């Protein structure tokens, strides 16, 4: 195959990998992590509550 036909396929693979990375970030948001360490307060919302 020509090297252009390799380069554009490699570019499409890298684009799909970046899309997988963004979907992995959005999947990492739904298990919400504490951004810092310290003392936690009360949960203002409990389980069953809808958040936006």
């Amino acid at each position: 195959v020509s090297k252009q036909q390799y380069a554009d396929a490699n570019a499409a693979y890298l684009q799909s990998k970046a899309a997988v990375e963004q979907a992995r970030i959005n999947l990492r948001y739904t298990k919400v992590l504490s951004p810092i360490s310290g003392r936690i307060g009360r949960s203002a919302v409990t389980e069953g509550a809808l958040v936006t």
Binding site: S2, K3, Q5
Partner: protein, 53 residues
Amino acid sequence: ASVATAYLTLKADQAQLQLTKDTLGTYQKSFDLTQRSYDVGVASALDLRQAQT
């Protein structure tokens, strides 16, 4: 009749030889262009091989 037809076949073969020379020049130019495209990296080796054939 034989001498006339032989002279006519000689002239016709010479004209057809000139046209096949032009065909060979055209194929040489096209093969050189495909060789340039393969050396750059845009065309694969198969497109070079068919022009070689």
